[PDB]
Each structure stands twice: as C-alpha cells, then as structure tokens.
Amino acid sequence: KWHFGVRCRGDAPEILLAVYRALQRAGAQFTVPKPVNGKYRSDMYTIKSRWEIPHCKREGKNTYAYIELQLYEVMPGCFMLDVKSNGYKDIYSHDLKSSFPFLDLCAMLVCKLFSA
Amino acid sequence: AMDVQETQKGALKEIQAFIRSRTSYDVLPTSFRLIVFDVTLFVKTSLSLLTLNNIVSAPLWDSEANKFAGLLTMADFVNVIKYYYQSSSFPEAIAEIDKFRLLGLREVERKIGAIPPETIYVHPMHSLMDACLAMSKSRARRIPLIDVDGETGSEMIVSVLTQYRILKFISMNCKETAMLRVPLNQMTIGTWSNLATASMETKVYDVIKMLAEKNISAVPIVNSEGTLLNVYESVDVMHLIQDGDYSNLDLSVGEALLKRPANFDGVHTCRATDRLDGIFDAIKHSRVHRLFVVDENLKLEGILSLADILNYIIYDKDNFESAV
Amino acid sequence: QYSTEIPAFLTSNTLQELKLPKPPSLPPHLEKCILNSNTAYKEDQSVLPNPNHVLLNHLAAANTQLGVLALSATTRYHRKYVTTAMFKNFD
Ligand SMILES: Nc1ncnc2c1ncn2[C@@H]1O[C@H](COP(=O)(O)OP(=O)(O)O)[C@@H](O)[C@H]1O
Numbered sequence: 001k002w003h004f005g006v007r008c009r010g011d012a013p014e015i016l017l018a019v020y021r022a023l024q025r026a027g028a029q030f031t032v033p034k035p036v037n038g039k040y041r042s043d044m045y046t047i048k049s050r051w052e053i054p055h056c057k058r059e060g061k062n063t064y065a066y067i068e069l070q071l072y073e074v075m076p077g078c079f080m081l082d083v084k085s086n087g088y089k090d091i092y093s094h095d096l097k098s099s100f101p102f103l104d105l106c107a108m109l110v111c112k113l114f115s116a
Numbered sequence: 117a118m119d120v121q122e123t124q125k126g127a128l129k130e131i132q133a134f135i136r137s138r139t140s141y142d143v144l145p146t147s148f149r150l151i152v153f154d155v156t157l158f159v160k161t162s163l164s165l166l167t168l169n170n171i172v173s174a175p176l177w178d179s180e181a182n183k184f185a186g187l188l189t190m191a192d193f194v195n196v197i198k199y200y201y202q203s204s205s206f207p208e209a210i211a212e213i214d215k216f217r218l219l220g221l222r223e224v225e226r227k228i229g230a231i232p233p234e235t236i237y238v239h240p241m242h243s244l245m246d247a248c249l250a251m252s253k254s255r256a257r258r259i260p261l262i263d264v265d266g267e268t269g270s271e272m273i274v275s276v277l278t279q280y281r282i283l284k285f286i287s288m289n290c291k292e293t294a295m296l297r298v299p300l301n302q303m304t305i306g307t308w309s310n311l312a313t314a315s316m317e318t319k320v321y322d323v324i325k326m327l328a329e330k331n332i333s334a335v336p337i338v339n340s341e342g343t344l345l346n347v348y349e350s351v352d353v354m355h356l357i358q359d360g361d362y363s364n365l366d367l368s369v370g371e372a373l374l375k376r377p378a379n380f381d382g383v384h385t386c387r388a389t390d391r392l393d394g395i396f397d398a399i400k401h402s403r404v405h406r407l408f409v410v411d412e413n414l415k416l417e418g419i420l421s422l423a424d425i426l427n428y429i430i431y432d433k434d435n436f437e438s439a440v
Numbered sequence: 441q442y443s444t445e446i447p448a449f450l451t452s453n454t455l456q457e458l459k460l461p462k463p464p465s466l467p468p469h470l471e472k473c474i475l476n477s478n479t480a481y482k483e484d485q486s487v488l489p490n491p492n493h494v495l496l497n498h499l500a501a502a503n504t505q506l507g508v509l510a511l512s513a514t515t516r517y518h519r520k521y522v523t524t525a526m527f528k529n530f531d
C-alpha cells in the first residue's frame with residue numbers, strides 16, 4: 001500500500017502544468033525550465049520550490065522550506081511525482097532534520113493537486 | 117552484598133545507576149515507525165486508525181503551529197464515558213462523542229478536569245531517569261519524547277516511551293536482574309487489599325467507572341470463589357466502541373469479553389513466593405502488563421503492576437485515569 | 441533562481457507542440473518503501489529495517505479508505521532513524 005510520491009496518469013507536460021499551478025496555489029515559489037538555445041531540456045521535470053513556513057510567518061520570522069519535486073515515467077502513461085526535502089533555513093544563524101514542517105507542506109501540496 | 121535482600125539491595129543500586137546513565141534515545145530501536153494523528157481528525161476515524169494499525173495510542177500533532185498537541189490513549193475515552201455515566205440522566209447521550217474532533221474531545225476533558233494543563237514530555241537526549249520520574253509523578257504509563265528543531269522552532273516528536281519498553285530494556289541490558297532473588301512477600305511492593313475486582317455478570321460501564329475512579333489500567337475478573345478467570349483492560353474498551361456502538365457498554369463483562377480478538381497479551385500470574393528475577397525474565401521474552409498474584413488454586417491475592425516495579429527500582433530504599 | 445509565475449509555454453496550448461522531452465524513468469530504489477516491512481511484530485511492531493540514505497526525506501503516500509491523508513518521511517535522528525507516518529484530514 002505505501003509508495004513514494006504521488007501517482008499521476010496522462011500527459012507528461014499536462015502533469016507538469018498541474019504541479020506548477022498547484023505550487024502557485026500553495027504560494028510556493030519555484031524554478032522554471034530554461035531551453036538549450038531551442039529547446040526544452042529533460043530536467044524541466046526537476047522543480048526546486050521554496051515555501052514560506054506559515055507558523056514562522058505567524059511570528060514573522062523569515063524561515064523557508066526547500067522542496068525538490070521530480071517526475072518519473074513509470075510505465076508508459078504512468079508517473080510518480082517524487083517529493084523530497086532539502087531542509088529549512090531562516091535568514092539568520094547562528095543539527096536536526098525534522099520531517100516537519102516538510103510533511104505538513106506535502107500535505108498542503110497534495111490538497112492543491114487534488115482540489116484542482 | 118553477599119546474601120538475599122543484601123544481594124538484592126545492592127543489585128537494585130546498579131539498576132538505577134544503569135537507568136540514570138542511559139538516555140531515552142538509547143531505548144529506541146535504530147530504525148522504527150511512529151504514527152501521528154492530526155488533532156483535527158474526527159474521533160471515529162482515529163479509533164478506526166488505531167485498530168487498523170494495531171496500536172492503542174498515538175501522539176497528536178497540531179499542524180498549524182507545528183506543535184505536539186497531546187497524547188491520545190484509551191484513558192481519554194474511559195474518562196469521557198465515566199463522566200457521562202455519572203452526570204447524564206440520558207443513556208444515549210454518550211453517542212454524542214462521534215461528532216467530536218480529537219481537539220474537541222480534549223476540550224471536554226480539559227473542562228471536565230481530566231487533563232493536566234501541563235503536558236508531560238521529556239527531551240530524548242536527557243536521562244532515562246527523567247522519563248521515569250515523570251511517568252511516576254503523573255501516573256502516566258507512557259510518555260512522549262519531544263525535541264525542538266531550532267531552525268524552525270517546530271517540535272520533533274521522536275517517540276513515545278512506555279513503561280513496558282523501559283523494563284524490557286532493563287531486562288535485556290542489566291545482568292543484575294538475575295540477582296533480585298527476594299520473594300515478593302518479603303518486600304513491600306504491589307497492592308494486596310481493596311482490589312477492584314469484577315465478575316462476568318458485572319456491567320462494562322461499572323468496570324469503566326472502577327478504572328477511572330482508582331486510576332487503574334485493568335480490572336481482574338473472578339468467579340464467586342474468587343478464582344482468577346480473566347481481566348478487563350482499558351484497551352478492551354477500544355474494541356467495544358470501535359464501530360460506534362456505544363450501547364455495547366451495557367453489555368455484561370462476559371458478553372464483551374467474547375468480542376475479543378486473539379491477539380491478547382494474555383493474563384500473567386505469579387505466586388507470592390515468586391521473586392523479581394523471574395519476572396524480568398517473563399518481561400524479557402513476553403509482553404506482560406501486570407502480574408496477578410495467586411495461590412495454588414488460582415485464587416487472587418493481589419496485583420503487581422508495571423508502575424509498581426519501576427517505582428520499586430527507581431526510588432532509593434474517585435475521578436480520573438492517566439494516559440494508558 | 442526562484443519565481444512566482446506559471447511558465448507561459450505551458451498554455452500555448454499545448455498538444456502541438458515542441459514534442460517536448462520525457463521525464464526520466466523510475467530508478468529501481470523508489471520501487472520499495474520500508475513501511476511495507478513488518479518483519480518485526482516478534483515482538484516490536486515499530487521496528488523497521490535500516491533505511492537507505494538516499495531516500496531520507498522523500499515523501500511517501502498510501503490509500504486509506506477512511507477519508508484522510510496518509511503521509512510519511514524517514515529522517516536521521518542522531519544515529520537512529522525515525523519514519524513518521526502522518527494521518528491527516530484534507531479540508
Ligand atoms: N504511535 C505509534 N506508532 C508506531 N508504533 C506504535 C505506536 N504506538 C505503539 N506502537 C507499537 O505497537 C506495539 C505495541 O505497543 P503498545 O501496546 O503501544 O505498548 P508496549 O510498548 O507496552 O508494547 C509496539 O511494537 C509499539 O512500538
């Protein structure tokens with residue numbers, strides 16, 4: 001029953017679109033493809049996002065969460081959208097890796113992918 | 117130092133020293149699962165999730181703040197039921213529970229007296245002694261290990277430590293358990309009078325009132341002659357209410373004990389002449405939650421509980437039930 | 441270099457169209473999730489095998505039939521591993 005990421009079906013860039021819009025609805029910010037003169041490079045399905053962490057926003061602390069997404073073709077027509085955590089960093093100083101708020105954010109994202 | 121009760125005396129000394137020198141971190145397996153619920157989950161859902169994952173408890177997460185939001189245990193249910201039975205002139209009012217989200221169950225409890233303002237918890241890198249003192253200061257039988265990620269201020273629920281898993285840890289790590297050779301009836305340990313007991317004829321809600329009133333986790337069932345037959349645990353209450361049938365509470369104990377899945381840690385017994393060395397061994401290899409002390413003919417004499425044992429080693433020589 | 445706006449070309453739209461690249465195929469290690477491992481109720485049902493230090497912090501998901509979200513990630517706490525499994529509402 002447990003599996004990495006979330007399943008997707010249909011058209012590869014159709015799914016890329018939905019993920020992008022879903023980020024936009026969460027208020028995450030994201031990298032974007034850049035072609036090779038032409039000409040879109042397969043790494044377009046590698047998205048680095050940055051998320052303002054709400055409970056820190058509530059204090060008014062500028063602490064961010066870094067989340068990388070990656071699409072993989074699984075069968076033809078089936079995809080895993082893989083989500084991984086690059087950690088959290090506040091704009092200040094001065095060494096735990098909690099799954100939170102990373103898991104609370106994947107929760108948000110998944111709500112956006114579905115309410116679409 | 118060189119005979120029973122002087123050898124035990126010294127043996128206990130090493131065991132507490134062992135306890136202080138370890139951390140809660142140390143008790144944990146090197147790779148494990150932790151199940152966590154959102155505080156806003158509905159009560160029915162959370163009951164379905166305990167059973168389905170085969171657990172009796174779960175730490176709650178308050179996800180908007182990123183903060184530990186309390187510990188969910190069968191005690192929460194036992195306390196609300198007691199309250200409704202003692203206060204409501206309306207037997208079907210208990211059904212109301214199902215509408216609550218865990219957060220609103222916890223408010224009813226808060227309002228009702230059944231909960232500390234202060235949540236018990238400890239840092240996992242502090243001393244294991246810290247965990248015991250707390251679990252015995254409040255009579256909680258499990259405790260969250262909570263740390264804080266300083267990059268976010270969010271809390272990190274690392275694990276929940278039970279009394280059972282502390283004792284198992286001690287059983288597997290301290291050679292000196294084998295030197296506790298003093299029979300129970302010589303020491304001062306367990307309860308030996310005023311036992312809350314019940315029979316098959318007894319009604320479940322009466323058993324639940326006993327559990328809440330004495331802050332006990334279980335109640336022995338005896339026959340007319342007082343031979344030990346079985347037990348009714350606060351975890352047993354979970355199996356009656358799991359489908360929303362809050363009228364299963366009017367069942368007799370016997371009827372309700374038939375609804376029990378095999379699965380069941382069993383009932384453990386010792387004689388009064390038994391010593392702590394054998395019990396740590398029972399613990400080493402099996403899931404004991406308490407020992408009923410009985411005679412030749414299985415007649416109940418008293419109860420030796422996990423708190424009882426922990427308390428005996430860690431210390432130098434009507435209302436409400438704690439986290440279960 | 442971050443950004444707030446939806447790339448334009450993903451609205452052209454959108455069949456026609458570039459005939460753009462595929463994503464890479466699923467690598468063999470995301471085929472298996474250690475949560476599917478309960479060798480351990482013998483007797484500590486929380487024990488998992490050691491994870492694989494590539495897969496620390498990758499979200500995994502699971503069907504509940506209960507109308508909530510099941511999420512999890514694995515992380516190192518000092519020298520031990522905690523796989524947390526979150527059950528959560530949608531609203
Ligand atoms: N919230 C939880 N998440 C994951 N596993 C749990 C949880 N609660 C209990 N368990 C597991 O269930 C099993 C039974 O434990 P439990 O009945 O809770 O107490 P004990 O530690 O006395 O066995 C143990 O293997 C324990 O690790």
Ligand SMILES: Nc1ncnc2c1ncn2[C@@H]1O[C@H](COP(=O)(O)O)[C@@H](O)[C@H]1O
Nearest residue numbers: 306307310311312331332333335421423
């Ligand atoms: N049925 C009972 N009647 C009287 N005392 C009990 C009973 N069960 C447990 N106790 C005692 O109350 C304390 C709490 O037990 P427990 O909550 O099972 O750890 C321990 O000191 C037990 O010895």
